[PDB]
Amino acid sequence: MILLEVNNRIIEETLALKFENAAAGNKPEAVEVTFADFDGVLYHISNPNGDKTKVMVSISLKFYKELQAHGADELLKRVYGSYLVNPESGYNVSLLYDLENLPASKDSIVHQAGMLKRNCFASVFEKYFQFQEEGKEGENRAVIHYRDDETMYVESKKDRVTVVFSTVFKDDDDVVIGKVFMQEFKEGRRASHTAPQVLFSHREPPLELKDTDAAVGDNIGYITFVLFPRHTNASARDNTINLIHTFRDYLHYHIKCSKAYIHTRMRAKTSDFLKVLNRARP
Template identity: 25%
Template sequence: MACFQRESPALKEILLRLYRAEKPMELDHHLYEFGSVEYHVQASASIPDNTYLSIATPLLYQDVVLSSGLPCYTLEMVKGISPDVIEIIEPPKEGYKLTLRLKYSRIPRNKGGVKMIASISSVQGVILSSQLKDMLMNVNSLEVSQGMYRPVKLIYHPREPFFVIKQPEKITAVFPMRFKEDTDVIIATAFFQELMDIGSSKAFVKAPHCIWSPIPPAELRGEPIEDLSTNGGFVSFDITGRHVEGKRLDKTVWNLLNFYAFVKYHVKSTRGFIQRRMRTRLESLVEVLYNAGIKDEHHIKKKNRGPKGVRKLLNFSKSKLLKKRYNFINKIKRIRSRIKIHWFSRFRKRWLNFSRFSSLTRYEKLN
């Protein structure tokens, strides 16, 4: 799940390391995000005020070809992050769309300086959001001849493209939804249907109109088949002029950029909730069955109880039973043994012994 953040955590950490260093330090570091965004940070110990930040990022609208790298509207928004600290280098370094010079000496040494570093680390978000803002505000530039409007494919993540379509008095954003597991498709489909029902209620009249369809909308006819092959259908939002007025423009842009992440987060949370409920339910059922088994055993014991004498015998401990059995066996052995008479052994030795004799007759062995 690629949640699009305004600030880059990795870039912020490196810039803060340079900001908090007691002595100027040498740094030459490359960062990669989303597999298509690259940052290159260079700092020199000899010239601490010359810290360069280069950014390589794909454009949202791939058909736009600009020699300067980024649109003027985007450059103005980047410059507006911190005009005293940021200086745009023209032309940018080879292989990058934008190169900035950061003047650390002008960053205050307090909490305001940390906030300024955080704002600078959000330059990638500013670039992407500014391109989408420019499209939403200047929709006439997307028109083609004969009054027809073609879809514009926007890519901020390689696996999560979406389309923006200019229509009379509105702009339609279409999101092809793809999921890896069938269970995720079921959860997401239920969520989209509920989103449609809630969006059509009176409480959310001012919200963008939401439509979900298992088949591509008519506006996407003619697009490549790989862009229209989905298992979760297509979600469309109708954005009117009311949704891009003033501060609403920034909120609308970020909601569109994070719609994929929001849906996947909802699916993941719902799946975890269902699994926890199933596990709890299973444990309760096992407990009921276990208690029922104990009651059945207790009932059988009561039913098979015999007379009091038998119950008393069963109440004896195992050691007592073994001891009684041993004594009983010894008594039987004594009864079956021969009767002993005192002095009889001496009498037998004296009077009952036969005298030994030898035969006078000898025999010879015949050959």
């Protein structure tokens, strides 16, 4: 696994598994899982208000208010079509699946459901991709707090969008390693001509602060992605979105896996030393 997945495996495997057996005459057993996902996002699957042949998928995001104030619901309303209902009291969005209702394509109408951590975010980007395409020079930023100490800023310039991530490396050492990745990312044009531009600012913000106040510190790092019109178009809108919204988790993932790799190399060297030391005995 090089790339992180966009879709959620627990949802997709749970519903798919329940659905093939339902569409077989077999009764449905109760299910109760309260799992989560990358970042501050909860998830609940249950049998509601005394129900049973009711399943429902609910999501709780601590920062839902901010996404909603950017046309998040309006989009979800035209997404599920009719599988969107009220909230399970405690969870900002709820989907309700009636087993005596499904179509004739589960592996088709189930994949979307697995994508929830993405469809909530899609609206802000789609909205600014639209902005760029319209050329509206009068719309504010898009300050969205997804993490207790993390913020994303989205803005659509004259002819190119800009998605900025303010990420935190709690472990100081993680900073050095993280910098190495940035260096290689900066010189990406040497391999990709049609690849988004990336900027990086340490501690201080590029042109932030502002108005509003920007997070500053030895453990803070800023990454700016620059989206053009060839990626925000009506042909690469979704894609660019489904990809870009996983970047933060992608970076921390590769930093941690890099550390794991360093462990393997190091094992491969310390273990060898012991063999050489004993190779002097009988």
